[PDB]
Design an enzyme around this catalytic site. Structure first.
Site, PDB file in Angstrom:
ATOM      1  N   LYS A 156     -21.111  -7.607  -2.129  1.00  0.00           N
ATOM      2  CA  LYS A 156     -21.871  -6.701  -2.992  1.00  0.00           C
ATOM      3  C   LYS A 156     -23.323  -7.158  -3.071  1.00  0.00           C
ATOM      4  CE  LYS A 156     -17.937  -4.966  -2.880  1.00  0.00           C
ATOM      5  NZ  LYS A 156     -17.670  -4.154  -1.619  1.00  0.00           N
ATOM      6  N   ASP A 216     -19.546   1.710  -1.663  1.00  0.00           N
ATOM      7  CA  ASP A 216     -18.362   1.441  -2.511  1.00  0.00           C
ATOM      8  C   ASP A 216     -18.697   0.462  -3.602  1.00  0.00           C
ATOM      9  OD1 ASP A 216     -15.741   1.855  -3.407  1.00  0.00           O
ATOM     10  OD2 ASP A 216     -14.960   0.225  -2.132  1.00  0.00           O
ATOM     11  N   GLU A 244      -9.744   1.188  -6.717  1.00  0.00           N
ATOM     12  CA  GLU A 244      -8.511   1.384  -5.976  1.00  0.00           C
ATOM     13  C   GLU A 244      -7.305   0.863  -6.748  1.00  0.00           C
ATOM     14  OE1 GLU A 244     -11.366  -0.107  -4.769  1.00  0.00           O
ATOM     15  OE2 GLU A 244     -10.962  -1.949  -3.684  1.00  0.00           O
TER      16      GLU A 244
END
Ligand SMILES: O=C(NCCCCc1cc2ccncc2s1)c1cc(-c2ccc(F)cc2)cc(O)c1O
Ligand SMILES: [Cl-]
Ligand SMILES: [Cl-]
Ligand SMILES: [Mg+2]
EC number: 2.1.1.6
Length: 213
Positions: free
Chosen positions: A142, A167, A197
């Site tokens: 990230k 994402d 998720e």
């Protein structure tokens, strides 16, 4: 064996060869019922599908393959002759991703590059004969979203209209990338709120369309 090997074996034993949709279902079932894993998942996957169908990209770059869930998702929707390049730093995961794509029958659409994005991005033009990218899916470390976006621009890999789709901009989060693109005149940004998720935790995708310098 590892969790990633167990997901691959489950697909091999519970999906139909050459049927990408059955592969996605099998992964989502396994990760819902047995072991969580960091695949983009069906909630966010549906938003990815809608984006892919809107833009019909000819050349997509993915940062972070993992087990190949997102690569299967995107490659199954590509038009004939369109291509996905996906970069994966973990060689075990690169090998699982290759096998996943082989099983799904998508191997001719996808090239899985084993290495680090900061090393491989500068090789795209010469080594992989890339001119510019139509779309980039960011799903790696990230804290690399922002530096790799700036590296892509430096390398001349972005064109007017190149779609970045990112994402996890909420969880784990990518605060510097979000602040940068949202504040830059060189990007037109849209947030798609969703869920992490396999979890009842809010997450989301950021779409950031490059506008040129
Ligand atoms: O770390 C994540 N994803 C990146 C893995 C880093 C893999 C890389 C690939 C590659 C290729 C090329 N160069 C460099 C790199 S580095 C990730 C983590 C979570 C999560 C969410 C909640 C949690 F409690 C715990 C984990 C959810 C997700 O959807 C993720 O995608
Ligand atoms: Cl994934
Ligand atoms: Cl999900
Ligand atoms: Mg992710």
């Amino acid at each position: 064996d590892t969790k990633e090997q167990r997901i691959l074996r489950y697909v091999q034993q519970n999906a139909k060869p050459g049927d990408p949709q059955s592969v996605l279902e099998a992964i989502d079932t396994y990760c819902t019922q047995k072991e969580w894993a960091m695949n983009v998942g069906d909630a966010k996957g549906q938003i990815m599908d809608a984006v892919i169908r809107e833009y019909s990209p000819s050349l997509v770059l993915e940062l972070g393959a993992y087990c190949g869930y997102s690569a299967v998702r995107m490659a199954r929707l590509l038009q004939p002759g369109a291509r996905l390049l996906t970069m994966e730093i973990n060689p075990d995961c690169a090998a699982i991703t290759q096998q996943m794509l082989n099983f799904a029958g998508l191997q001719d659409k996808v090239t899985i590059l084993n290495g680090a994005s900061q090393d491989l991005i500068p090789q795209l033009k010469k080594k992989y004969d890339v001119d510019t990218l139509d779309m980039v899916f960011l799903d790696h470390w990230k804290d690399r979203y922002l530096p790799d976006t700036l590296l892509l621009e430096k390398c001349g890999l972005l064109r007017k209209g190149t779609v970045l789709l990112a994402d996890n901009v909420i969880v784990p989060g990518t605060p510097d990338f979000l602040a940068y693109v949202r504040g830059s005149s060189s990007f037109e940004c849209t947030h798609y709120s969703s869920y992490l998720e396999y979890m009842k935790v809010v997450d989301g995708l950021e779409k950031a369309i490059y506008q040129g310098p």
